[PDB]
């Protein structure tokens, strides 16, 4: 079987490159961040604009939801993260401490912690309630491209231009594993069950790792990725897919097990830097850079 993703909605509004799209855990909303300094919220099913969230002084690289879908965290060129109340649009906390651009961010499942990665080569862990930086991890020797908590929050995975993926004990702050040619690692995330890590490198390659055995189980190629830190995803609502943007302006979909490309989605007119998979429906959101500036919503039967 192969999926049949068809374009349903194009969401215009951002005035610069869109950096990140994320579906809310409860499936109602899509949040988008942009170099235009703005966060925008959209209805996930009808693509209808909901609100604009403003406050950051410079462009925003990433946005992430709390488990209850009530809060957002953003990561900005202004060296801060901000925590937002989604319903009011209000900035609740500004997370200060990174010495350079913040590129990536995530809540833990418990949503009492935030993790962030910066151009400053560190990974920071923040208390959501107080805004205080609890730990600064000397994670990498180059900009940190991605940070993600595993399913139980006990682990953090980080990736960097230094060519390394690292797994950290959240509680102890110590490095549990280093996956080490080492081309820049531009993306990393845990699988839904926490057993695997999907990692992208800037040599046109995505890899699925069993990090406990430290072994590469699958490779996904055929797409273009040598410049931009492009977000990838596990698609699990229907067929079991791998989804990624690409520098040829397409969204690529692979069969996770066989590694064959099952679909390529055309429509965008610039690099697709971010994709998101809806938590319950077979819906993909994709976002493109400055020649495009739109988010597209795609729907499949499997
Ligand atoms: C969702 N992902 C999170 C991680 N991310 C990222 C990773 C690595 C580096 N870097 O080491 O250069 C830079 C960026 N950010 C930007 O490229 C960017 C920054 C501000 C505004 C717009 C954009 Cl697109 C891209 C989006």
Curated annotation (Swiss-Prot):
Pfam families: Beta-prop_WDR5 (PF25175). The modification N6-acetyllysine is found at residue 82. GO terms for molecular function: histone binding; histone H3K4 methyltransferase activity; histone H3K4me1 reader activity; histone H3Q5ser reader activity. Changing residue 77 to N: Strongly reduced affinity for histone H3. CDD domains: WD40 (cd00200). It comes from Homo sapiens. This is WD repeat-containing protein 5. Keywords: Acetylation, Chromatin regulator, Host-virus interaction, Isopeptide bond, Nucleus, Repeat, Transcription, Transcription regulation, Ubl conjugation, WD repeat. One of its GO terms (biological process) is transcription initiation-coupled chromatin remodeling. Changing residue 119 to A: Significant decrease in interaction with KMT2A.
């Amino acid at each position: 079987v192969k999926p049949n993703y068809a374009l349903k909605f194009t969401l215009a509004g951002h005035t610069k490159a869109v950096s990140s799209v994320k579906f809310s855990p409860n499936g109602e909303w899509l949040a988008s961040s942009s170099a235009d300094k703005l966060i925008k919220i959209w209805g996930a099913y009808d693509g209808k604009f909901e609100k604009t969230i403003s406050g950051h002084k410079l462009g925003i690289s990433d946005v992430a939801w709390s488990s209850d879908s009530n809060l957002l965290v953003s990561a900005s060129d202004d060296k801060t993260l901000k925590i937002w109340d989604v319903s009011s649009g209000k900035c609740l906390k500004t997370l200060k401490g990174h010495s350079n651009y913040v590129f990536c961010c995530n809540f833990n499942p418990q949503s009492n912690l935030i993790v962030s990665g910066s151009f400053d080569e560190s990974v920071r862990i923040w208390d959501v309630k107080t805004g205080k930086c609890l730990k600064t991890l000397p994670a990498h020797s180059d900009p940190v491209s991605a940070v993600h908590f595993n399913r139980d929050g006990s682990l953090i995975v980080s990736s960097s231009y230094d060519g390394l993926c690292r797994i950290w004990d959240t509680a102890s702050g110590q490095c549990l594993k280093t996956l080490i040619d080492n081309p820049p690692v531009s993306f990393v995330k845990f699988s839904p069950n926490g057993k695997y890590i999907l990692a992208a490198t800037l040599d046109n390659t995505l890899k699925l790792w069993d990090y406990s055995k430290g072994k590469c189980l699958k490779t996904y190629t055929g797409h273009k990725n040598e410049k931009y830190c492009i977000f990838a995803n596990f698609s699990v609502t229907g067929g079991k897919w791998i989804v990624s943007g690409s520098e040829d302006n397409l969204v690529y979909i692979w069969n996770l097990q066989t590694k064959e490309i099952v679909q390529k989605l055309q429509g965008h007119t610039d690099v697709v830097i971010s994709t998101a998979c809806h938590p319950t429906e077979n819906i993909i959101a994709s976002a493109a850079l400055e020649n495009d500036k739109t988010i597209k919503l795609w729907k499949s039967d499997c």
